[model samples]
Target: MGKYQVMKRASEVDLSTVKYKAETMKAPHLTGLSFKLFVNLLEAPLIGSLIVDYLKKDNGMTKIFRNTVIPEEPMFRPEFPSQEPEHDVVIVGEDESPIDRLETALKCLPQYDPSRSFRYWKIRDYAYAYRSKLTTPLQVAKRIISIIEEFGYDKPPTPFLIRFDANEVIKQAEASTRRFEQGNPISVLDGIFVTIKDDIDCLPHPTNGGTTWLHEDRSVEKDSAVVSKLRSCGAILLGKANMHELGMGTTGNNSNYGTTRNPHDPKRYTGGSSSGSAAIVAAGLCSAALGTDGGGSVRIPSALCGITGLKTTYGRTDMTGSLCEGGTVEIIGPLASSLEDAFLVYAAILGSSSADRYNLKPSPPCFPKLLSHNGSNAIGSLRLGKYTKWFNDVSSSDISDKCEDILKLLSNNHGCKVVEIVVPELEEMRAAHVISIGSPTLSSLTPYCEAGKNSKLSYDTRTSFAIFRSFSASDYIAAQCLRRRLMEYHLNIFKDVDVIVTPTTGMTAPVIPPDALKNGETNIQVTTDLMRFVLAANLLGFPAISVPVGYDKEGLPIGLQIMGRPWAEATVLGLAAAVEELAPVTKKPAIFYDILN
Candidate 1:
């Protein structure tokens, strides 16, 4: 065999391989070409199906119907088991704009006490208008009366519930819109409305990132690269969405703005600090939204709430003015109802710009190359290396079993060759994640460490800081070195495979008890548990996407994550498209799917 043929079955070196030689297993080539082939096999058909469905049925004349055929999509659609009201909230129009029609739609459906969870259907006409293509940003302001007449003062919820100057955001959008359009066609997202995370320097919000200590009285002069790209695509920034303090924790429980609930299931956790981003998307608050992921914030909530979210390579999307480490072990990405929608925003945000301060030399693009043979062509191409070791341990048997079923679907239907892949350094990578970031948790609290400051930060922040202070420098450096080794290992794997697939989390969303922790207490176990499966990607700086794969025993959703090499977001998304093809997801978080079912 030629060297290329010899390298085809690229041998993987795991922590333990002394007992089994590479020759023992009937291995196939593990090249990037193989990975792309697997992805193509998986995603092509699914994406084509979705595009056909969306184009076919999302028309104003046609009623949208749920197709459980797509693994990620069906999981998010509100289940209407019967004609009865699911809860206080009523379904609004198809689009994400037109405030008046949205309120009218809400008023026409059902009403409940706004204070009680059982009361008021918090719907938005703006979202409806956008979905229906009824109005533009300019028309949105003009049509505010329809929303005002129906919903009154709280007509359309701002991205966040905190006090914000809505008029200012609108005005900023107007000004920025004009400027952003100067160079490119600003009509790609002309009719779309969106919610932005608070961690970014949105035109008017100035990115407080849920931090009172870093609060600024002035608005930002420019948009963050992510925001700018969105603006260029004709996306409007409604307002800054709330997040966990400094994007540091899960649970979305922030001292600055309180926790955001899962719009689909209020009692269920809305994974955070991207909680609001996922909540708004699942709630149909906007066409799509932007979120940041240092850990699994974007993917976890996307899974919990039944949506699609992407956490691109550390700097795939620009992060200037980001309140976090500026995409060091973090990134900002899109959350959407479908993988296609997520990809739309991702494409817009990716590109080099001379005007962008965060812009640097552009990275090479990785596109999906189809694997063809026997007249059976798949939607995406990939050589899948299943990391079952950790998944088998953390995931419930049922969940693991479901994942296996998905693997089978890929193999039987799509011609993907499934095999186990073990990275010898995964444990060290996990350790290094904590080691590198464990200490920095305290570093973030330095502003609050002033002698006269007696007021503690949010319980999550306070407790996290306390834990950080306990770490030594030796621990931090050891973690960094470990991180480098892990990165090198992944890079080598990437040279062989296009994307790596895994479960986004070990389990479905867990309920947050009213007293999960004491008033001022933080549950380290809960925090760590929430991050377990997701922390590795952060450590390796890969572009990871989480889309619905299956449901747990409780009927809540589960996610399949596709992690790509650094700067290979397109490949990861393509891999996601493939998964979407095999396991059609149905949205299940109806007002009463859990309660009435």
Candidate 2:
């Protein structure tokens, strides 16, 4: 028998046992629908694997199934004013593939026009000014609707993609303005839609980690904290985006829903758990998005997708009742086309709230306006350090070389002092970072264990939980102790250097075929690589920002990270603005533009 059949049989054994147990329960088979549920649990993953394979054939059953089931129809379900212009909808003539439609739209955009799709997406000063000038709430609201309409919407929300309308968001923003005297700064953002990562909870849709079992079982009373705040600010919460099952790894290959392809290179991995946010944003599906950064979730895709991301200090944004504990080492962050958008989103998420007992004060951040982006605000005579060993050792060090050139440019032409600093503990720290975070394997496996006890979930969930349980406590604890020291080491270094610089990832994105991760099941290597440059900040409760420096030899976007002192997000933004002015880098991802055509 083929390996798939063997695996299928094993999965059936597990499912059958669970269903048998369910049948023996006090309310055993209460719905009389027990047998149907049993068959689904045993066959789902195997069928999921088959469905993915069928799609890959790309010409026969796969193509037909994809068209009928996962149709590539531009996700076009806009519920806003203004019909799409023919030119906006077509590239040359006749209906085309969704990718071709997107390509034509991007290439035809008027240069740097905010009205055009994502032209100045990351340009925050320009965006805020635009928002400020079009002062009337009604007019601004309409523009917001138009922008969302421009982004279009998806029907039958696919893996790593979401669809939400602008008109629905205006009401929430109006409510927020009434409640807060300052008016909702976020409300004007109503027409701006965002894809919620599947791991996150949003209203009307139960949080599912790409697992169909949770789709039917879990219930949420309120929107995730980030979702609620964003809606108040006028964000249209589209459907949930996909992620690695249980938020376990970084390849973005293992979502129970399915893998999200990279926009720059569809065959490549989008990175995770914010994979869809990065891919959709790169495709100009949204101007900006909310992403969670646990270790390096937000920064990985931001770097890979040729955008900017801010991984805030732990607890910088509240994540109450959001599945993962708030005080845990993850912060909600923003992913956008430019550094400026990163700042604006960061500003929106920062503030004191009466909602929590912690009642943390708003982080003291002060980003510069246009002047900062004009090179006038460069940090002259300030000390900047680059970690050579960590960055220079990557397999694809060209990404690192690009970052080094930026440092050289700053030192030689921008009037800033630059030096190389190495933390000897980094290599040791990297390994510990993973195991420490993954330690307490038992507790982390709870969600899956609960799933296994219930017969409705697929074997993938139960199997994945079992895999997580196979780690030793000693490795986990040792890693934690090392992480604390590494944090101290990073904190101590900041006393001298204004900002620390490093490459965001070792390599550019790798095209991840759909369902690639469904097989591996337990490799943490991809997760480690994704956070190669940004996890230290998460571990230490410090803020870090990743900004595009330039492109690599292959012409893929390369990113440089700026680490800031605790709670000093404004300083990081100022530095990002400085880099933007001095370097002035902009290059479309190869997925959007060909390298050799």
Candidate 3:
């Protein structure tokens, strides 16, 4: 809209003129040496172009981005019309201190109940235990150290953590213990444990991003903006967590660091790239942890692991000192065992980057009034938009069935309304996301890749690199053009309904092939299914949350996603709380640590 000429807004287009076409992915599932050899051939210039063109055509990407001419100007990043005040929220200043915000945030929580039990402990539970002298941060830190040692990495089965220093953990715990002894606790988060994803910087731990060489190439001298906020609130930082190498894959199949396993079942994957962050929270090692979400990186793993993940609106959180600081789609977010804990961590880190404030003009940050007297009424007042056909498109009916049941319960119990809606050009959005996210990733790694570092990457990641390198300047701009068109459609839809509903993923945690553990694998079907519904949130720069709804036949978790218009985090979170209310009791993961006990 700024520099380029435009035809018309998608909202201005005719509905009957638009047709919905499902996605079609053509890559064969390849693994082990076969996968490595495939990447080799795909890297050949002329041969690779031919293969890329065929794949693009088969997926309908070529017909949209290559053959068509759209007059809309590119929306390189998410920009929105000024929004109305959301219901059941407290407006917060971005400049407020983390400690002060936590104080304001604490009042929104219902008083803690000693007898209440959840599948995992929450931040309040940890704080309560510390205050009652039932346990100390020192004690929990010691227990966590033991658990980390037991699940030590650099071996066959990948551990959730990449770098964990017992000494650093002990030091932080002692400081927190001292605060409690003096009755001068920092905040509700005092002594609470949290893990930083490999991509987000945490002091004394270099950012490797699940790769063996990234930390060596770059220096991480301080905690990321989010990490600093967590530390200031007295949360004990548990080194860097494992992730999909450089946030490349969806399955968390990292051969660089052994792939992180799902806590529900060790044989399956924890969806990446926030794989370790979700696994850590799911296993009860922490109440909540930080992860970066570019494309379902946070939500996918949370859904797979029976936890809650919040992907903040683009530019919602300051990204300074993180690897993805400049990326448009990615943002640091919280993955927690429960909804309340997500609220706490998000409160600590909620603020826009300096650049975003100057340019994007983001709205004031806010939190859901979960403890308000009007909470029920506010929830009931919501209108949820669901594209029934799209919602029902899942690899297994368990996914759609479980999610649909929750919508029914919300309708019956809370009087929330579910309105049928249509979202057009979904395939176009998919292609746009691929180019938008892939282009930036490739730009960052190109010099290193050209310096003979390509061979150092895992089979799957290298395969991804080969394709990312194929995207041209024309392709990227065309994708951005499509981005603007899709935004208009979604923004128009938001006027009628408060939020969009979908199953977080089309499938649950997939089993890890034995051979994939060594060399990694590329299964486009699994990737497509896992990432299907998540792109709109990332690509459109909207706030979204994935709350565990129920379990599939394999016992893997299914999550209901609530995506809202830009800067509507409060609305998105409130809906998540409503969904979590009727979800079946969360099951304990096979590998769990009761650190609080």
Best by TM-score: 3
* Residue runs of model 2 more than 4 Å from their true location after superposition: 1-158, 162-190, 215-217, 352-365, 368-370, 373-378, 439-468, 471-476, 513-528, 589-597
The lowest-lDDT stretch of 10 consecutive residues in candidate 3 is: 1-10
lDDT of 1 by residue, 354-401 (tens): 432234223533333212122135332456777666556544676677
User: On a 0 to 1 TM-score scale, where does candidate 2 land against the true structure?
Assistant: 0.68
Model 2 lDDT per residue over 1-597, tens place: 233221111111231132211011011111113433433443375664453343234322222222222111220111111211211011232222222322332332224444432143433322343355433333334554454454432322234454344555566435433433353443334334566776677777676655555555567778876676666555556566666555555666543455676766767777776877777667655567777776687888888878888887666566653545533456778888777556545544554334432443333334433333233334664578776666675658788778888787777765777766656444444445444444433364467556664343333344333333333554344445455545545655665677788888877886553334433332334444566677677666677888878777766777788887666665576677667666654665544421011
Query: How many Å off is the CA of 417 in candidate 2?
Result: 1.6
lDDT of 2: 0.55
* Better-scoring candidate (TM-score), 1 or 2: 1
Clashes of 3: 0
**Model 3 steric clash pairs:** none
Off by over 4 Å in 1: 1-14, 17-160, 168-185, 216-219, 325-327, 352-362, 366-381, 438-445, 451-456, 516-521, 591-597
TM-score of each: 0.69, 0.68, 0.96
